[PDB]
Curated annotation (Swiss-Prot):
Its main location: host cell. GO terms for molecular function: CD4 receptor binding; monoatomic cation channel activity. It comes from the Viruses. Keywords: AIDS, Apoptosis, Host membrane, Host-virus interaction, Inhibition of host innate immune response by virus, Inhibition of host tetherin by virus, Ion channel, Ion transport, Membrane, Phosphoprotein, Transmembrane, Transmembrane helix, Transport, Viral immunoevasion. It is a single-pass type I membrane protein. This is Protein Vpu. It comes from Human immunodeficiency virus type 1 group M subtype B (isolate HXB3). One of its GO terms (biological process) is symbiont-mediated suppression of host innate immune response. The N-terminus and transmembrane domains are required for self-oligomerization and proper virion budding, whereas the cytoplasmic domain is required for CD4 degradation. The cytoplasmic domain is composed of 2 amphipathic alpha helix that form a U-shape. The modification Phosphoserine is found at residues 25, 29. The keyword Flavoprotein does not apply. Homopentamer. Interacts with host CD4 and BRTC; these interactions induce proteasomal degradation of CD4. Interacts with host BST2; this interaction leads to the degradation of host BST2. Interacts with host FBXW11. Interacts with host AP1M1; this interaction plays a role in the mistrafficking and subsequent degradation of host BST2. Interacts with host RANBP2; this interaction allows Vpu to down-regulate host BLM sumoylation. The gene is vpu.
């Protein structure tokens, strides 16, 4: 923010956290973890990932 953006790319860490959770749970819990991601797809990735930009 103060140092011209870049402070954004911090979120990229989520990918690392996402994979650990599977390892950190015991039974992984894909239905809870993987299926969570699917929710993003149904609304058309509120983010610019729908390819068509929703």
């Amino acid at each position: 923010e103060y140092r011209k953006i870049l402070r954004q790319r911090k979120i990229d860490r989520l990918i690392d956290r996402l994979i650990e959770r599977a390892e950190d749970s015991g039974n992984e819990s894909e239905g809870e973890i993987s299926a969570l991601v699917e929710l993003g797809v149904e609304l058309g990735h509120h983010a610019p990932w729908d390819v068509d930009d929703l």
